[PDB]
Amino acid sequence: SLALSLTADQMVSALLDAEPPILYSEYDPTRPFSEASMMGLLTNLADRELVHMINWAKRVPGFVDLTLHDQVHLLECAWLEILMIGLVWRSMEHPGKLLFAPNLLLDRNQGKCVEGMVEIFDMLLATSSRFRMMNLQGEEFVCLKSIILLNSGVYTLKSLEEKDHIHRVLDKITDTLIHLMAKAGLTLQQQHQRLAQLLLILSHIRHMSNKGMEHLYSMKCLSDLLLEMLDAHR
């Protein structure tokens, strides 16, 4: 594995290079909104984002070393978390608003147009406000996003060795996070504290994904890929 040999700076460079682009929605302000229209817009956007996410994952150091079945499992598990932390990152500069796309900026009032959406919106807004107050850096964001990919499905016959490899790469990304914070001039106490703060947010991103997922495969109760990603969570 090359991932275990990369320096902290090389890991950052790799993750930054691997970043997916920001896509546009089909949003037309001159067109009337509705529950179906709003959900169709977000679904359409998520679906196109997934394709880029899959290719992004291929460029996350250590991911390609895994079996194909494991790669599938990790992405099935983490895809909504990854979409959500991306959404939250883009939305940092827009307090009280969610920036799904450069042409799609929504506030929580428009969240009430879909059943159960306003609850997820508030949680996303809270997360965004947290990132903003912490002054989350782009280098930190790409580390967190890669952690989510590798961590979210590591639990859930040797392949214990495969689990071990994931744990090793996760330690590497931790080292990288610390490296960035030390580079930033934080004291050791401040480094550990900030590291903890960032990782605790991942628990909130997990919660938001699970709650969102719960509502999402009840909405249908969508493209084929997205339908299969949703179905993986039953």
Partner: peptide, 10 residues
Amino acid sequence: KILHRLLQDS
């Protein structure tokens, strides 16, 4: 699965 396929596409 489509995800399985897209992961294979070298």
